[PDB]
Amino acid sequence: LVPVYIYSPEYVSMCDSLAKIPKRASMVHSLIEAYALHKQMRIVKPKVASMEEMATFHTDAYLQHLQKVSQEGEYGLGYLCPATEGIFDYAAAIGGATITAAQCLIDGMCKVAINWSGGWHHAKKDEASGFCYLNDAVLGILRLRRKFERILYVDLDLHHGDGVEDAFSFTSKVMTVSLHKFSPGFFPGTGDVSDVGLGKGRYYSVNVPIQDGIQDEKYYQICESVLKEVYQAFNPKAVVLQLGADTIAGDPMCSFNMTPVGIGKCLKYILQWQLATLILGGGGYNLANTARCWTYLTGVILGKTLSSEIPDHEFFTAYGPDYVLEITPSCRPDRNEPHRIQQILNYIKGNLKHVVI
Ligand SMILES: CN(C)c1ccc(C(=O)NCCCCCCC(=O)NO)cc1
Ligand SMILES: [K+]
Numbered sequence: 356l357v358p359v360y361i362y363s364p365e366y367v368s369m370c371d372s373l374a375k376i377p378k379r380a381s382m383v384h385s386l387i388e389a390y391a392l393h394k395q396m397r398i399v400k401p402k403v404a405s406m407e408e409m410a411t412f413h414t415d416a417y418l419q420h421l422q423k424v425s426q427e428g429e430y431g432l433g434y435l436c437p438a439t440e441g442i443f444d445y446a447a448a449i450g451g452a453t454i455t456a457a458q459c460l461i462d463g464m465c466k467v468a469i470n471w472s473g474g475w476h477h478a479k480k481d482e483a484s485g486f487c488y489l490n491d492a493v494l495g496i497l498r499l500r501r502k503f504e505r506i507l508y509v510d511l512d513l514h515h516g517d518g519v520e521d522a523f524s525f526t527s528k529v530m531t532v533s534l535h536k537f538s539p540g541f542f543p544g545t546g547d548v549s550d551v552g553l554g555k556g557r558y559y560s561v562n563v564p565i566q567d568g569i570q571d572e573k574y575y576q577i578c579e580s581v582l583k584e585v586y587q588a589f590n591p592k593a594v595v596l597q598l599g600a601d602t603i604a605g606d607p608m609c610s611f612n613m614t615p616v617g618i619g620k621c622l623k624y625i626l627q628w629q630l631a632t633l634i635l636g637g638g639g640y641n642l643a644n645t646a647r648c649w650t651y652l653t654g655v656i657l658g659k660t661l662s663s664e665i666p667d668h669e670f671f672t673a674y675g676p677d678y679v680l681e682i683t684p685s686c687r688p689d690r691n692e693p694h695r696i697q698q699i700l701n702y703i704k705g706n707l708k709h710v711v712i
């Protein structure tokens with residue numbers, strides 16, 4: 356019935372410590388609360404993932420090493436994933452939160468479960484990557500598999516959801532769809548349209564490479580085109596949706612030129628399928644804009660229209676100088692040639708023809 360909102364004071368305090376997005380969790384929760392949206396959701400405390408729960412995907416060797424280094428502060432713990440004190444605990448908290456959301460969906464407690472602090476899509480079974488030390492999305496998908504036969508993973512973060520795609524590269528039980536920037540030197544470097552999965556999983560991986568400057572209209576046209584085909588061919592029983600906000604105009608990633616409205620249209624399209632849906636966050640480095648985005652998306656989920664004026668709350672000053680919920684696109688050029696986008700969409704349409712349930 357009402358959406359499940361994964362939250363607890365302890366969980367947010369933990370997430371707030373993440374070095375790349377300091378206090379972002381509190382900002383997001385704070386704005387959602389200022390709009391009184393929590394009163395329309397079922398608040399559920401997340402559990403902490405146990406070593407064995409994390410091991411449903413990650414290797415013991417990796418988890419044991421992560422735990423060891425987290426104690427002092429060849430597993431990818433380099434420049435992007437430094438071994439800081441307590442990182443194992445922060446990771447287990449987020450993995451546990453996504454698993455908890457998955458469990459709520461399986462129990463039929465709700466049709467939609469939200470963990471805005473999740474979405475660490477780059478982590479591999481035995482390697483940390485791109486600020487991600489644990490892949491909570493994979494953990495949630497594996498939990499959902501207990502109830503739902505086919506799971507669709509959709510990743511709208513600016514970056515390719517390589518960790519999730521790789522985890523399920525060889526299977527047809529989980530289809531991964533990622534829309535992302537694909538350019539020379541842009542992390543992680545994978546996900547061209549020709550990347551369709553491997554072996555029994557061939558054609559069960561979908562990738563839409565996009566160039567700088569994409570805006571809401573074209574982005575939704577692409578997303579609707581792909582998801583329509585995906586739904587028809589794959590007939591998913593549940594969905595895990597990653598909504599990293601690093602695609603939003605104003606993000607220091609300076610790549611895409613989206614607004615929450617565009618991402619909201621993609622979300623609505625998925626919500627109309629009326630399937631169990633696990634909602635996750637992800638990237639988003641302009642903190643106030645990420646809070647604006649996810650708060651607006653929470654409103655979309657609840658079917659509510661929010662006031663344009665940012666309500667007074669703990670982080671009010673961060674929304675200056677205009678203090679409004681809407682985000683204005685930049686004047687950066689759209690580098691996406693219509694013909695190339697059309698080619699990409701047709702290539703994908705053709706690939707999905709190979710998918711038959
Ligand atoms: C010259 N020098 C020392 C460097 C140059 C470039 C990078 C980099 O791109 N790093 C990758 C940035 C991480 C992208 C992950 C963001 C995200 O939200 N993923 O989902 C690093 C160092
Ligand atoms: K993506």
Ligand SMILES: [K+]
Nearest residue numbers: 523526529559
């Ligand atoms: K797959």
Ligand SMILES: [Zn+2]
Nearest residue numbers: 512513514638
């Ligand atoms: Zn990202």
